Amino acid sequence: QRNGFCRLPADEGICKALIPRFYFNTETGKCTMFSYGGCGGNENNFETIEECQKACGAPERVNDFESADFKTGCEPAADSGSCAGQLERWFYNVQSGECETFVYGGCGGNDNNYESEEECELVCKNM
Amino acid sequence: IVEGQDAEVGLSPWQVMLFRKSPQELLCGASLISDRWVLTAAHCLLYPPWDKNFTVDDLLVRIGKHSRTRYERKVEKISMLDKIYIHPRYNWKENLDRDIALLKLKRPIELSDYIHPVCLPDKQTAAKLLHAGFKGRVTGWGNRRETWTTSVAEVQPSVLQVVNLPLVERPVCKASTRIRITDNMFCAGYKPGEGKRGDACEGDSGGPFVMKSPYNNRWYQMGIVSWGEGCDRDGKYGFYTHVFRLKKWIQKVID
Amino acid sequence: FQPFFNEKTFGAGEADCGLRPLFEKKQVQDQTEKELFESYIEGR
Ligand code: NA
């Protein structure tokens, strides 16, 4: 992704040492060992495979995203309210485990009332 | 965003979170350009070295967000995509040249205090605004520092982050990197000794680089967070997809 | 300002683009936009 040096070719340089290093190979997508001569080259050059993976592999990312409050937002049965509108809404059905459509009046009801299937599934079909 | 601050509520109402629905994660930033179209980086969607080729079934966009993690009921809008369009000349192998993608929403969304599209530059706006030293604004939910010692957890923002960064002249951008730069890119950030810091980081990619026009008071998206060399390193700068240079492609896809 | 794209395929929103409901629309400036305008004096 962001790190541009990951797309640079392995560069041994012109010096004559045989130092084991790691570089990100874009054809394979793998951190790959090469011999580094000890001077020059580029930033696609890591002492350990771990350092390479951290800089150039797919990153470690958090999954700490909050869902709806299950009790108030996902558990209650569908409620149309008092108004006489015909709005298609979605609710999580505890029995079936699915987000399903119901007809909503426009006023009242509960929090288990979403504008799309995918919003409902996001916030109700997760912990 | 490194060396930024918490954004005010509604500071950036065009800000879009590109969101993976399977392992729930922030993939990337993006921007709302109409009630129907979202602009992002191609590499957010397609990157073969990481076996990455996201379909409309893999993704959601979350618009109107402030908190990175809270479900902002009745303020944020969560929606699926209809279509994905990646630039056909996107150079993933070399330098991420033409790092641009268009995302068509499945349904048009309603605008609010928190949801509102950014302007795209015309020729005169790009000429007047793209001057070295002029500052633009970058926003995102990405990492707050490039590296951590124990966990990626210690570098997460709780809310949207903002940083203002000066545009940098071509010669300075060129000398900062071994990577080949094109006219589809510009770079931004402070120089060593300017006494100020700030950069985009991992997770901010696809996000907007915007400038407020002194001519008509409107915000224009001049760039897309594309690539860099680490985050906020001395002597290094962030690179951004030059939106006006790729405007012909945007119009072709939308028309 | 005048819109660039065709609304039939672009959708709505271009005419009012870049004007924030909570800032420009109510003549409230944000915390750091002054810094941006100051850069216009300083820059090329
Ligand atoms: Na820097």
Q: Which sequence spans correspond to the domains of chain C?
A: 1-44
Give the torsion sign (CA, A42, B156, C23, B17). positive
DSSP per-residue codes, C1-44: ----S-HHHH-S-STTTT--TTTGGGT---SSHHHHHHHHHH--
Q: Is the CB of residue B20 less than 8 Å from the CB of residue B52?
A: no
Q: Is the CB of residue B79 less than 8 Å from the CB of residue B115?
A: no
Closest chain A C-alpha to B95 CA, distance in angstroms: 7
**Strand segments (E) across A1-127:** 19-25, 30-36, 87-93, 98-104
Shared domain for B56 and B36, answered yes or no, is yes
Which resolution in angstroms does this entry have?
Answer: 2.3
Shared domain for B92 and B164, answered yes or no, is no
Assigned token pair, B110: 């309603």
Q: C22-40 b/e with 16+ CB inside 10 Å = b?
A: bbbeeeeebebbeebeebb
Taking contacts as CB-CB distances below 8 angstroms, the residues of chain A near B153 are: 62, 64
Shared domain for B4 and B23, answered yes or no, is no
How crowded is the C-beta side of B48, counted as CA atoms within 13 Å? 11
Give the Cα-Cα-Cα angle A93, A95, A99 (nearest 5 degrees): 25
Strands B101-105 and B135-140: unpaired
Span(s) in chain A for CATH 4.10.410.10? 1-66, 67-127
Assigned token pair, C19: 């004007």
Q: Which residues surround ligand 1, an ion (CB under 5 A)?
A: B 189, 236
Instruction: For residue B224, report the phi and psi dihedrals to the nearest 5 degrees.
Output: -125, 130
Shared domain for B128 and B240, answered yes or no, is yes
DSSP per-residue codes, B35-90: SSEEEE-GGGTEEGGGTEE--TTTEEEEES--BSSS--TTTSEEE-EEEEEE-TT-
Q: Is the CB of residue B204 less than 8 Å from the CB of residue B140?
A: yes
Shared domain for B176 and B252, answered yes or no, is no
Assigned token pair, A80: 């149309």
Q: Is the CB of residue A89 less than 8 Å from the CB of residue A104?
A: yes
Q: Is the CB of residue B63 less than 8 Å from the CB of residue B79?
A: yes
Residue C29: which residues within 8 A CB-CB, separation 6 or more?
A: C23
Residue C43: which residues within 8 A CB-CB, separation 6 or more?
A: B131, B132, B133, B134, B135, B166, B167
Instruction: Say if residue B91 is exposed, middle or buried (CB neighbours under 10 Å; 0-12, 13-18, 19+).
Output: middle
Q: Which of A4, C42, C33, C37 is nearest to B238 (CA)?
A: A4
Q: Is A116 on the interface with B (CB under 8 A)?
A: yes
Q: Architecture of C1-44 per CATH?
A: Irregular (4.10)
Q: Is the CB of residue B219 less than 8 Å from the CB of residue C20?
A: yes
Rounded Cα gap, residues C22 and B12, in angstroms:
10
Give the torsion sign (CA, A94, A98, A99, A104). negative
Q: Per CB distance under 8 Å, which residues of B are interface residues toward A?
A: 21, 23-26, 43, 47-52, 60, 68-71, 73, 78-80, 93-96, 107, 152-153, 156, 177-179, 200-203, 205, 227-231, 239
Give the torsion sign (CA, B200, B157, C13, B41). positive
Of B9, B164, B166, the CB nearest to C22: B9
Rounded Cα gap, residues A103 and C27, in angstroms:
41
Q: What is the DSSP letter of B126?
A: H
**Chain centroid offset of residue B79 CA:** 19
Domain range for B181: 1-12+118-244
- Per the structure, the count of domains in chain B is 2
Rounded Cα gap, residues B219 and B118, in angstroms:
6
Q: What is the DSSP letter of A50?
A: H
Rounded Cα gap, residues B240 and B186, in angstroms:
6
Q: Which CATH number fits domain A1-66: 3.30.530.20, 3.90.180.10, 1.10.10.10, 4.10.410.10?
A: 4.10.410.10
Rounded Cα gap, residues A80 and A87, in angstroms:
9
Instruction: Say if residue A14 is exposed, middle or buried (CB neighbours under 10 Å; 0-12, 13-18, 19+).
Output: exposed
Rounded Cα gap, residues C25 and C36, in angstroms:
19
Q: Is B99 a catalytic residue?
A: yes
Give A16-19's long-range contacts (Cβ < 8 A, gap of 24+): none
Taking contacts as CB-CB distances below 8 angstroms, the residues of chain A near B68 are: 65
Rounded Cα gap, residues A125 and A127, in angstroms:
7
Rounded Cα gap, residues C36 and B222, in angstroms:
14
In the numeric block, the tokens 């009630």 are attached to B35
Give the Cα-Cα-Cα angle B183, B187, B189 (nearest 5 degrees): 170
Shared domain for B64 and B182, answered yes or no, is no
Q: Do chains A and C touch (3 or more CB pairs under 8 A)?
A: no
What residue in B sits closest to C15 (Cα-Cα)?
A: B119
Shared domain for B55 and B104, answered yes or no, is yes
Rounded Cα gap, residues B178 and B180, in angstroms:
7
**Strand segments (E) across A8-125:** 19-25, 30-36, 87-93, 98-104
Assigned token pair, B217: 């008071």
Q: Is the CB of residue B109 less than 8 Å from the CB of residue C11?
A: no
Adjacent-strand bridge partners of B81:
B105
Q: Which of B229, B179, B153 is nearest to A63 (CA)?
A: B153
Rounded to the nearest angstrom, the distance between the alpha carbon of C22 and the centre of ligand 1 is 31
> Are C18 and B167 an interchain contact pair (Cβ–Cβ within 8 Å)?
no
DSSP-derived 3-state class of residue B159? strand
Secondary structure tally for chain B: helices H, strands E: 3, 16
Rounded to the nearest angstrom, the distance between the alpha carbon of B235 and the centre of ligand 1 is 6
Rounded Cα gap, residues A62 and A22, in angstroms:
26
Rounded Cα gap, residues B223 and C19, in angstroms:
18
Method: X-ray
- Residue C8 carries which side chain, given as an amino acid letter? K
Instruction: Say if residue B201 is exposed, middle or buried (CB neighbours under 10 Å; 0-12, 13-18, 19+).
Output: buried
Q: Is B205 a catalytic residue?
A: yes
User: Residue B65 is part of a domain; what is its CATH number?
Assistant: 2.40.10.10
Question: How far is residue B240 from each of residues A127, B110, B180, B204, B211, measured CA to CA in Å?
Answer: 36, 29, 14, 11, 13
Assigned token pair, B177: 């990197």
Closest chain B C-alpha to C10 CA, distance in angstroms: 6
Q: Which of B29, B15, B129, B103 is nearest to B64 (CA)?
A: B15
Of B37, B111, B217, the CB nearest to C10: B37
Q: Is the CB of residue A47 less than 8 Å from the CB of residue A21?
A: yes
The fold adopted by the segment(s) A67-127 is: Factor Xa Inhibitor (4.10.410)
DSSP-derived 3-state class of residue A122? helix
Chains that touch A (3 or more CB pairs under 8 A): B
